[PDB]
UniProtKB/Swiss-Prot annotation:
The record marks 4, 59, 64 as: Fine-tunes the proton-transfer properties of H-64. GO terms for molecular function: arylesterase activity; carbonate dehydratase activity; cyanamide hydratase activity; zinc ion binding. Changing residue 64 to L: Reduced activity. This is Carbonic anhydrase 2. The lineage of its organism: Eukaryota, Metazoa, Chordata, Craniata, Vertebrata. Changing residue 15 to E: In Jogjakarta.
Length: 257
């Protein structure tokens, strides 16, 4: 099965998922000088006040913080988007070392980690139908650098001991994802894909320019998670990132000058 090891990592995924070599794959390098300001983009609207988190799950590739997406409770709209996109989960990608871990890069710079807040277009009814559409998902990507602690991340960090291994979940109610956002909502946007198999080309990416800072202790706790299940040989969950893919026939647009 696919993963992030030498024998099953990103360079192998195309054998089971040929779209891995497709025309709109993610992540990409964001070349800041080539991205063009688009004055027709609108401000992002991130409306998370009524978010209902439910559970946190180690799925063997990352951990997902899952939300109730059966009503418009936590939604993303505006920016490049037409319509309303409902938050279903967030997760991170991170490195074994502070100098790598992000999926997107900025002028080839790798951040220590990257947060993905995943939303689906309500016009398609359910996430499973949305991923079959070219405008099915909107993913808000936020870079993490190591410095000061992010207070709003600590509740996530502290539950990780209870979901160490693949297949473990824990109750995770009343978590406010607003505590993971930077000050500015300036962003880059482009059409792309899921960054894990099945790699479907269904995502409008919105990548924030401003990173958030997390502490060394916080990222060290991410690195104590395991890819394996309980009772199996320990393989630390680190370096769960796909590298940048060819931009091909795409333009990255900036919301800011
Ligand atoms: Zn992701």
């Amino acid at each position: 099965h696919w993963g992030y090891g030498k024998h099953n990592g990103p360079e192998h995924w195309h054998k089971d998922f040929p779209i891995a070599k497709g025309e709109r794959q993610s992540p990409v390098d964001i070349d800041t000088h080539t991205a063009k300001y688009d004055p027709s983009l609108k401000p992002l609207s991130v409306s998370y006040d009524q978010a209902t988190s439910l559970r946190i799950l180690n799925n063997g590739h990352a951990f997902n913080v899952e939300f109730d997406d059966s009503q418009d409770k936590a939604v993303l709209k505006g920016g490049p988007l037409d319509g309303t996109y409902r938050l279903i989960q967030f997760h991170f990608h991170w490195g074994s070392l502070d100098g790598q871990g992000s999926e997107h890069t900025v002028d080839k710079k790798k951040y220590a980690a990257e947060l993905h807040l995943v939303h689906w277009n309500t016009k398609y009814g359910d996430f499973g139908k949305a991923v079959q559409q070219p405008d099915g998902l909107a993913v808000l990507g936020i870079f993490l650098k190591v410095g000061s602690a992010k207070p709003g991340l600590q509740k996530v960090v502290d539950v990780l001991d209870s979901i160490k291994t693949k297949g473990k979940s824990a109750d995770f109610t009343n978590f406010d994802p607003r505590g993971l956002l930077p000050e500015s909502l300036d962003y880059w946007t482009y059409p792309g894909s899921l960054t894990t198999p099945p790699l479907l080309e269904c995502v409008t990416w919105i990548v924030l320019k401003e990173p958030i800072s997390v502490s060394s202790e916080q990222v060290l706790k991410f690195r104590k998670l395991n890819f394996n299940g309980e009772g199996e040989p320990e393989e630390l969950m680190v370096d769960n990132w796909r590298p940048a893919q060819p931009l091909k026939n795409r333009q990255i647009k900036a919301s800011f000058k």
